[PDB]
Motif scaffolding. Structure first.
Motif, PDB file in Angstrom:
ATOM      1  N   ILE A  44      60.865  -7.736  39.725  1.00 15.27           N
ATOM      2  CA  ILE A  44      60.332  -7.819  41.182  1.00 15.27           C
ATOM      3  C   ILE A  44      59.157  -8.295  41.363  1.00 15.27           C
ATOM      4  N   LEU A  45      58.899  -9.305  42.260  1.00 13.13           N
ATOM      5  CA  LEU A  45      57.634  -9.696  42.682  1.00 13.13           C
ATOM      6  C   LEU A  45      57.052  -9.156  43.947  1.00 13.13           C
ATOM      7  N   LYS A  46      55.629  -8.339  43.699  1.00 11.86           N
ATOM      8  CA  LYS A  46      55.230  -7.611  44.877  1.00 11.86           C
ATOM      9  C   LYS A  46      53.846  -7.940  45.162  1.00 11.86           C
ATOM     10  N   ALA A  47      53.245  -8.299  46.380  1.00 10.96           N
ATOM     11  CA  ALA A  47      52.031  -8.763  46.472  1.00 10.96           C
ATOM     12  C   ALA A  47      51.127  -7.859  47.601  1.00 10.96           C
ATOM     13  N   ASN A  48      50.213  -8.240  47.540  1.00 12.07           N
ATOM     14  CA  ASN A  48      49.096  -7.800  48.644  1.00 12.07           C
ATOM     15  C   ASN A  48      48.470  -8.889  49.320  1.00 12.07           C
ATOM     16  N   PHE A  49      48.493  -9.001  50.435  1.00 10.26           N
ATOM     17  CA  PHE A  49      48.002 -10.220  50.974  1.00 10.26           C
ATOM     18  C   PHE A  49      46.814  -9.641  52.210  1.00 10.26           C
ATOM     19  N   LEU A  61      46.509  -9.984  45.367  1.00 12.63           N
ATOM     20  CA  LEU A  61      47.107  -9.880  43.918  1.00 12.63           C
ATOM     21  C   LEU A  61      48.685  -9.886  44.248  1.00 12.63           C
ATOM     22  N   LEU A  62      49.273 -10.518  43.133  1.00 11.75           N
ATOM     23  CA  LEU A  62      50.714 -10.257  42.977  1.00 11.75           C
ATOM     24  C   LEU A  62      50.888  -9.824  41.619  1.00 11.75           C
ATOM     25  N   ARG A  63      51.919  -8.702  41.447  1.00 11.96           N
ATOM     26  CA  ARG A  63      52.390  -8.353  40.232  1.00 11.96           C
ATOM     27  C   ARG A  63      53.933  -8.421  40.192  1.00 11.96           C
ATOM     28  N   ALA A  64      54.345  -8.641  39.015  1.00  7.49           N
ATOM     29  CA  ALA A  64      55.888  -8.624  38.574  1.00  7.49           C
ATOM     30  C   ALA A  64      56.142  -7.424  37.962  1.00  7.49           C
ATOM     31  N   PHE A  65      57.281  -6.717  38.223  1.00 14.20           N
ATOM     32  CA  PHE A  65      57.758  -5.197  37.885  1.00 14.20           C
ATOM     33  C   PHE A  65      59.012  -5.487  37.245  1.00 14.20           C
ATOM     34  N   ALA A 102      62.980 -18.885  32.449  1.00 18.56           N
ATOM     35  CA  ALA A 102      62.963 -19.821  31.571  1.00 18.56           C
ATOM     36  C   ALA A 102      62.929 -18.785  30.508  1.00 18.56           C
ATOM     37  N   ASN A 103      63.006 -17.479  30.620  1.00 22.16           N
ATOM     38  CA  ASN A 103      63.118 -16.261  29.736  1.00 22.16           C
ATOM     39  C   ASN A 103      64.504 -15.485  30.001  1.00 22.16           C
ATOM     40  N   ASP A 104      65.461 -15.970  30.732  1.00 20.89           N
ATOM     41  CA  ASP A 104      66.611 -15.465  31.149  1.00 20.89           C
ATOM     42  C   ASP A 104      66.585 -14.323  32.093  1.00 20.89           C
ATOM     43  N   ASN A 105      65.488 -14.067  32.671  1.00 24.07           N
ATOM     44  CA  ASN A 105      65.013 -13.088  33.881  1.00 24.07           C
ATOM     45  C   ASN A 105      65.593 -13.484  35.141  1.00 24.07           C
ATOM     46  N   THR A 106      66.123 -12.452  36.025  1.00 23.68           N
ATOM     47  CA  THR A 106      66.526 -12.650  37.165  1.00 23.68           C
ATOM     48  C   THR A 106      65.285 -12.183  38.076  1.00 23.68           C
ATOM     49  N   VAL A 107      64.665 -13.026  38.867  1.00 22.48           N
ATOM     50  CA  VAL A 107      63.660 -12.912  39.664  1.00 22.48           C
ATOM     51  C   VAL A 107      63.947 -12.685  41.202  1.00 22.48           C
ATOM     52  N   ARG A 108      63.265 -11.661  41.790  1.00 25.07           N
ATOM     53  CA  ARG A 108      63.303 -11.456  43.279  1.00 25.07           C
ATOM     54  C   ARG A 108      62.289 -11.137  43.872  1.00 25.07           C
ATOM     55  N   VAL A 109      61.923 -11.544  45.061  1.00 23.02           N
ATOM     56  CA  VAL A 109      60.708 -11.225  45.715  1.00 23.02           C
ATOM     57  C   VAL A 109      60.717 -10.100  46.856  1.00 23.02           C
ATOM     58  N   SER A 110      59.895  -9.865  47.141  1.00 20.61           N
ATOM     59  CA  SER A 110      59.480  -8.607  48.121  1.00 20.61           C
ATOM     60  C   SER A 110      59.826  -9.098  49.521  1.00 20.61           C
ATOM     61  N   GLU A 111      60.076  -8.357  50.638  1.00 20.76           N
ATOM     62  CA  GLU A 111      60.291  -8.599  51.814  1.00 20.76           C
ATOM     63  C   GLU A 111      58.714  -9.488  52.332  1.00 20.76           C
ATOM     64  N   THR A 112      57.887  -8.882  51.954  1.00 22.30           N
ATOM     65  CA  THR A 112      56.515  -9.459  52.232  1.00 22.30           C
ATOM     66  C   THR A 112      56.417 -11.089  51.882  1.00 22.30           C
ATOM     67  N   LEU A 113      56.759 -11.236  50.648  1.00 22.31           N
ATOM     68  CA  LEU A 113      56.793 -12.578  49.969  1.00 22.31           C
ATOM     69  C   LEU A 113      57.789 -13.489  50.672  1.00 22.31           C
ATOM     70  N   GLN A 114      58.993 -12.789  50.784  1.00 23.68           N
ATOM     71  CA  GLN A 114      60.234 -13.695  51.703  1.00 23.68           C
ATOM     72  C   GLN A 114      59.697 -14.320  52.822  1.00 23.68           C
ATOM     73  N   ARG A 115      58.860 -13.526  53.771  1.00 23.57           N
ATOM     74  CA  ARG A 115      58.246 -13.836  54.894  1.00 23.57           C
ATOM     75  C   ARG A 115      56.959 -14.903  54.977  1.00 23.57           C
ATOM     76  N   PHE A 116      56.429 -14.583  53.916  1.00 23.94           N
ATOM     77  CA  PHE A 116      55.170 -15.571  53.612  1.00 23.94           C
ATOM     78  C   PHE A 116      55.531 -16.723  53.388  1.00 23.94           C
ATOM     79  N   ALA A 117      56.862 -17.195  52.760  1.00 23.35           N
ATOM     80  CA  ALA A 117      57.396 -18.389  52.213  1.00 23.35           C
ATOM     81  C   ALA A 117      57.485 -19.221  53.418  1.00 23.35           C
ATOM     82  N   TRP A 118      57.931 -18.748  54.675  1.00 20.10           N
ATOM     83  CA  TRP A 118      58.041 -19.431  55.812  1.00 20.10           C
ATOM     84  C   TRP A 118      57.092 -19.398  56.940  1.00 20.10           C
TER      85      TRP A 118
END
Length: 118
Positions: A44-49, A61-65, A102-118
């Motif tokens: 899961i990708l989490k961010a501070n904006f 900052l963004l960190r992946a957990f 590329a290393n066979d992980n499934t990646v999701r993004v936080s609610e905050t990042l999903q909004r930032f995308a658009w």
């Protein structure tokens, strides 16, 4: 005055971490780090904006957990750069996602990042 909206606790943002197999690569005005050892995990990708007029502005900052809360990736702004654009941020995020997938992980993004995308 800049405020900050974040997916992360103080501890999650301040925690020191290191990569079992380090990879550190610049994507535009941003620094991307990821542990190349990590595989087959749900991440899961989490961010501070910064926030300006109720609008997500710059990535601090963004960190992946993993599911156990282990840090396996990070995106930080280059300190010497005057600044970055939204496209810069989204570009860097996609690069990290690609690296993890590329290393066979499934990646999701936080609610905050999903909004930032658009």
């Amino acid at each position: 005055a800049s405020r900050y909206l974040t997916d992360m606790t103080l501890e999650e943002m301040s925690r020191d971490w290191s990569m079992l197999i380090p990879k550190q690569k610049v994507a535009g005005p941003l620094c991307i780090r990821m542990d190349q050892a990590i595989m087959d995990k749900n991440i899961i990708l989490k961010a501070n904006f910064s926030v300006i007029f109720d609008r997500l502005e710059t990535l601090i900052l963004l960190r992946a957990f993993t599911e156990e809360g282990a840090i396996v990736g990070e995106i930080s702004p280059l300190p010497s750069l005057p600044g970055h654009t939204a496209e810069d941020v989204k570009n860097a995020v996609g690069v990290l996602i690609g690296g993890l997938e590329a290393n066979d992980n499934t990646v999701r993004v936080s609610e905050t990042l999903q909004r930032f995308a658009w």
